[PDB]
Assembly symmetry: C3
Amino acid sequence: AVAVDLGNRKLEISSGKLARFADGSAVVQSGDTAVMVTAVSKTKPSPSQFMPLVVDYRQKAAAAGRIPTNYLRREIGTSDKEILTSRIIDRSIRPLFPAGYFYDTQVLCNLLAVDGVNEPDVLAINGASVALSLSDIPWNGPVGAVRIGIIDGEYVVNPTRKEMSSSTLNLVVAGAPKSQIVMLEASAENILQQDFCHAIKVGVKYTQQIIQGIQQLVKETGVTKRTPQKLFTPSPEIVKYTHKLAMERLYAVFTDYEHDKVSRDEAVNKIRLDTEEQLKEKFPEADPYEIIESFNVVAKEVFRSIVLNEYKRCDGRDLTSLRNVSCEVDMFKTLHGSALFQRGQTQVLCTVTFDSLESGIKSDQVITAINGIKDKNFMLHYEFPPYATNEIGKVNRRELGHGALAEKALYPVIPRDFPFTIRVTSEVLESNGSSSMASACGGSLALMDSGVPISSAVAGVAIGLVTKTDPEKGEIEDYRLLTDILGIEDYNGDMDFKIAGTNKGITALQADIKLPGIPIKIVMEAIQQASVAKKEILQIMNKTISKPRASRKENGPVVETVQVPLSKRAKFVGPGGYNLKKLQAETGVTISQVDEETFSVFAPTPSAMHEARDFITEICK
Amino acid sequence: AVAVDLGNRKLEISSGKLARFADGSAVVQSGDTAVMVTAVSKTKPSPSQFMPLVVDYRQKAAAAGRIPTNYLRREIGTSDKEILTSRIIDRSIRPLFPAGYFYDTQVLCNLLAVDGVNEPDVLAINGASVALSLSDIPWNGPVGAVRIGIIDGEYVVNPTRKEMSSSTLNLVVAGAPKSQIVMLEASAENILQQDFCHAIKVGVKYTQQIIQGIQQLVKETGVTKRTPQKLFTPSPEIVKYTHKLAMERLYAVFTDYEHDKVSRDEAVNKIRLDTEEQLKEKFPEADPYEIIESFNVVAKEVFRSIVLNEYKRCDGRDLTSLRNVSCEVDMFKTLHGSALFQRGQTQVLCTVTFDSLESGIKSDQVITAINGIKDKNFMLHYEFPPYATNEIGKVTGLNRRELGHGALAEKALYPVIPRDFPFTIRVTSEVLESNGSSSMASACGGSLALMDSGVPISSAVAGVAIGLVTKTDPEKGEIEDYRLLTDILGIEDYNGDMDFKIAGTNKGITALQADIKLPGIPIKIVMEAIQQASVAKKEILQIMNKTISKPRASRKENGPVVETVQVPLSKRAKFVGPGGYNLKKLQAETGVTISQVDEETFSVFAPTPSAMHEARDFITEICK
Amino acid sequence: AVAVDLGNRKLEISSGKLARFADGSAVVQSGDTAVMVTAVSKTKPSPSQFMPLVVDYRQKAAAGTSDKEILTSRIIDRSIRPLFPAGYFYDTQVLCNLLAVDGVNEPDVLAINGASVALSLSDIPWNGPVGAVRIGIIDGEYVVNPTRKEMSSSTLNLVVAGAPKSQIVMLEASAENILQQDFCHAIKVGVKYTQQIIQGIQQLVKETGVTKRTPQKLFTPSPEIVKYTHKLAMERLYAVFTDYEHDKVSRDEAVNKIRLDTEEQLKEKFPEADPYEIIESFNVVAKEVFRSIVLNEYKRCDGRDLTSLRNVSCEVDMFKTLHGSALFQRGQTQVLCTVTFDSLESGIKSDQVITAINGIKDKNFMLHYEFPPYATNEIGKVTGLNRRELGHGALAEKALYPVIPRDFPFTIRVTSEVLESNGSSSMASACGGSLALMDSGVPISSAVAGVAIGLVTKTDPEKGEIEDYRLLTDILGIEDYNGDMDFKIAGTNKGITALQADIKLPGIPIKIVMEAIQQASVAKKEILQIMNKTISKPRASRKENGPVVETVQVPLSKRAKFVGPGGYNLKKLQAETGVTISQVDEETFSVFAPTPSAMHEARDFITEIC
């Protein structure tokens, strides 16, 4: 039992009482909110050639004093907030696992109690760190996580639920020992870069206090780590031989600036088949996966040596250059708003639909959208169809994560008290890069095209990173920050620093660091380098459209109130409102009784309003 | 971009702007409705020993009554209307893939925009044709698809939603080069055979114009097809050796007229085990699947040679003869209506269940719109349990086929269903045994159960399936000789060329679904099959009329009732309770439904008279 | 074809008409309720290396699978599974289709009988027929197969499945806190009726002329290679099971260490043996040694005697904001139980799969049971309730239902989560659920405790009858795995409220069942002594931070503005704060808030509207 003091908050950490069969377990309590986190890792290597790690943040209707609402089966699926919290925890702990740890691992977060004051998501990140630290699972160093808010210009750590509602920033920082940063998740109300950057420094300061608390609990408990029967990393001598075979061929491919996404992959694949064939004779006893992974290591090393040594990228760009950006608006007549955003070989189709205000709130049946409510009646829905990468797939977590990230980016510029629910759909028709950030740019374009009076245009961009690190020390010697990374740059790089905002502020941030932490200095520069790129993108978007249209499209939704006499009300509504629901199903009209005499009527198109209108007139005789 | 003019309708095709990563992609636009279709095919041979082809017609609903129902409510699943459209597209393109193309393939549809006037389903079929034509995926020929309706006696190509709502015919035709037919899907309001047949030839004429437009687009943009790693067809040397080994034994099996479904299958299997082991020794290098497929090729060709050469089927029937048909009603006393229809070794049990009109809607604006209200309060649910074929199957239920067969049988019976029936009519067809057209038996059994339940249907409906065996020149590809079979078994469908299911009254046609396994068939064969099925339909309707010929004078005495109970204004709070608790508590323990009709009166629906009696107890005990 | 008379009830059994393609099929009719049951078994051995048997009982009337259907499938699976031969590793499915229901005769019992007839007439290798009846107690008299009206007034709902020679195969009961002598008598009455049903089925089998298939191979280890395994691992396994310092994990790995050593030695001696045949031979030898210690020495593997309980510790009120909570530990099994109060109208609005199954419980009470994968140090998918967790939740809910008070102002929901598993977590859910209910302040009549009884028998293979046996109190996981039954029974200090016997043998005598009920009442008494020390009576009131209900009056001229267009304002408030405003009459709105703090914020909404 260790208590960590963070300003005016206390963080109680416990272990050894509950769930003792699990490989690791911990209970983290702040105020009256308690979260138990367990960690299980199988000792048999998984047949798949990667690290299978699943994080399931399990919210409970209990622990909050709420029996599940009106539906027979009491729990159905996964809420949006549950998936997002699971994603944050996964990104905080995944980089710290060793290389070649191909063992099935699961982290589960059970909510013991919730007081409605101290948020449990931050505790779940800390609990995952304690559970993994006390377990025998090989894991590298504790992780501290805090949330930073700005209330009246003051930087508050772990704000209460009341404080979040008055905060211009929602930043979550996960830090490793010696002030490294492992995860960044921000949702700001278009705040200045200086204020945003200070909050990161204050956050990393607090996560170091948590880490020292966990290290004390680990020392007292007396943790000993297991010895995995095998870490699946290619041997140095097989890797070195691969380097001799395919270094020159790979060097020519990545210096060939005429390659596109498919041509580059095919050219690399041709060397892969050629090289893997000759590797077997020299090493007949090597595992078939070990042969594959040796090529991936060599291809990654050659790819990174070019940008570090020569400051030029695989497509010939310099470190700060964007890809070609093209925008269109108003492509299909019947859509309320539309936009096609192209960034290199990434293409996104964004659509705006206006729905009724009543459809903003969802209730009953399933859990995924059980208590459906959004602050501004605005939601963004992100689709990543399998043909965007020329693939066959089932028609998930990544789509929901990217949809929330793009929705965070656009949320601060959405006007309040809009007549309708605003629903943006982003379809990734082609994918070679940050389709998630293109959804914010295209979403901004479609929003002004539709006539939504947004305060300012929003542009996002992704910043990559390549580092050189010695094995004898582990520190970062030199690094290159890349603007607007490709898919191969993100795959072979060290982070995907996605950040969006207007031309005068920052609205969203999601840093997916693949290294075991990076210095605050690198994070500081990535935010600056993205500010320059974002301004360049916004100038391209502004030429396509610079201000929202003075009105909505003529074929857009319309709301009007009909008068139904008291004598004729029963005929109109029908038995238990059967005629109302029948009308809303054949036509699109949504009818809601404002008053015993009047019915507000919402038609998504002027055609529906006429079609419903004759239904009302004949019913009223 | 190519524009195709179909009468007064305009079709626009284009490619090269959206989703350039896909193997093939196309945008098909009519009016303001634009549909984008994508084709992707893997270059690695699938581990599966057939052609995995999946068609997914997605929809961000705005032609479903302009209610989004997008990802905001997608974690429920896929609508039934989406799966039906995916089945029409799958049937239109599957026959044109080459034999042995064992490669994973997916066709996806994306409704970029829908204006609520032009239906996007037909555009999605044409888009799949264009996307496959421009791609490098080996696909034999372009396909044109139109919808034909009849409004005031005039044929209309691609009718709008307004015209579709006043049309006595909903026919979708997919045509191949040289006026061949690959897909037929129709539902009619009991129209004459001559009117129905004229719509097919009108439809095929329009699909040839579309094929002409698509071929122009394929010429304008260079299209080079890939060379597949290998096409999975048995070696001609292996096939001819299998024929020398199993022709006599297989011929004896197929000329044995005392076999049933199971005994015939095991007799064929016994030859399969004996032959295949002999094949392995002769051809050690042969693939394990090559041995299996070669035997299937020989068994299929021996089976079809008997129908071609001797005009006799494997069960001794002639080409026109039906199987034995038996009917039965009033199986169980408690059911509102029931029937046990049997044809050959296919057995189907059909139940009619009345319900409240209010059970049609779900009180949720979305979800209800996803599966809209049926025009008449009439739906058919079709079940294909695993024991119907003596196999172990998943219990999740309602796969694509069960949803399609249920839709086919529902539109077969829809034209005769009366209007303004006081209750919701639910028909459930359960297939207890299957050796043939259970879907068409569900229409015949469904009409028997409907008549027994006392629903005053206008007339009885019977369905039948017509098979086809052809002799095709190997080089020209033309059909030389063919035989049409009436009321085919399952083996004749498996080894045949088409599954031509068609239902109707004794004076008209109500539904049709032709599942052609050939890369197109001449229209003259389609007309002959429609006429041959007309003869068989009359024979089936004669047998069913002996069991029952007219609907019963009234519904069963243990059937549902509806009546209104008055409550005073002062007593509404105690009656309904706080938060409506009392009403839903009464429904939980009685099953009745109480609806606020007027401020003073409530309508009570009770599934049984006894349930009404219990419900009336609550009202009176509260009354005191 | 064959009619069976059970007092005033008639059972009609027929075959040969419907679904003739299935391996076996039967129709069972009582009154106007008919049930069709089919059985299919593949002739190709399954690769699973066990017996894959799925029972799927489905109600055809669409208006996924309701919880009643899953519970019925569990009873049917329990009634037929033990009678399959050993080594029958063939995929097998049993489907039950309700052709008609009259609303008077319950089709669930007919489905059990139909499954026995369909298996009896089929060619699937299956042991003797099984009869099944339901016994109720109406105004002091014992009724066989009571109707729906009689079941509502019954103090007992007991389902008995019997095998030939009055053996009991399945027992599953829920009683309204009834005496042990009344419970035991009802079992005797039920077994007598199941012999009459078996007589009818045997007559139908003889008339039909059933012949059984010969399976390709019965997957049982060879006797000569099992004997060699005994010569290798006997002494080492004996030492492991006589070491009383082991816990669940250390004992498992000690046996596993012997297993790995033995597998290599077996492989060289029998290289021709199937790799699974080596695995099962060790499983047989280990099971034999484990039971021989109980029979010969009357001492369990953890050092206690046949009647001793495991260590029991309880604890209540562990988190301030929970309405009620309890932590029940029994040996290495740990369960955390929570109580939540919501409104009476909490769960009844739209979207019911079938009518009359809307969200109203009999006492506005329900129990939800969760079995997370870390309870056994395992990895698994966590979304959605499988069949076992639905069955265990229903068993624990039946155990607590009799003592739940009526007319409680709030809907009571109990959640049990198994943090550790080494035994009866389902019965620990009844004990912990009882403690949390008392801590939460709901006035339950008495404390309820549950316990599981094991059984180890020695039967000669010459005839198969039971020579001698031992009944074990509060079994571990290993004692259930290597034992003969999991006899779970719960009740208060003066009665029985629930029972679920999972017999692995092909039937046990009625005297063994009677003794298990008596041995369980002694153990249940000891548990109730420990639980009473922690908390012996419900708290005088609920926690101060619990739910509160207060009415708010709104005038007619203000009704429209307050409710919003189509009740939008009220729907919005429920979405964010969680409070619910329901109309009571033309002037009153009942407000429910999970906490008094959330009520204060909610009251600021009406005042803001003012």
